[PDB]
């Protein structure tokens with residue numbers, strides 16, 4: 001679990017969105033596993049606007065942060081789950097690191113701010129949904 005709070009927006013994994021997120025829907029994209037809902041309280045998180053390929057992510061299944069080197073956002077094949085059929089997920093960044101399904105939502109950050117959230121994983125792999133291209137999160 002986990003979310004990003006910036007301005008009047010809450011960014012979460014689309015597969016973990018609540019009834020309240022869908023009732024206050026701003027934008028969603030199944031192909032990216034992202035959903036953004038509106039909030040009444042002001043968020044203070046900062047979104048990175050950069051091309052960093054190194055950062056630190058929070059891993060809840062270890063209660064620890066880990067440094068990662070990650071690939072540029074791209075279309076990557078993701079095996080079927082109870083949430084989605086087998087498909088290509090877009091804007092996904094892959095890295096070597098520990099992750100379990102419940103780690104989705106953990107923030108990945110670089111020196112410029114929030115880069116994305118955990119969205120997929122594998123055997124010694126962790127994948128992050130990028131949010132740096134969503135310029136409207138700041139206006």
Ligand SMILES: CCS(=O)(=O)c1ccc(OC)c(NC(=O)N2CCC[C@H](C(N)=O)C2)c1
Nearest residue numbers: 033078081083099100101119120121122123
């Ligand atoms: C044996 C567990 S594992 O295959 O290593 C593993 C580690 C980590 C994992 O998530 C961090 C997973 N689960 C997933 O990647 N997904 C399930 C939830 C929806 C995700 C999506 N964006 O489509 C895909 C499996």
Ligand SMILES: [Zn+2]
Nearest residue numbers: 050052110112
């Ligand atoms: Zn950066």
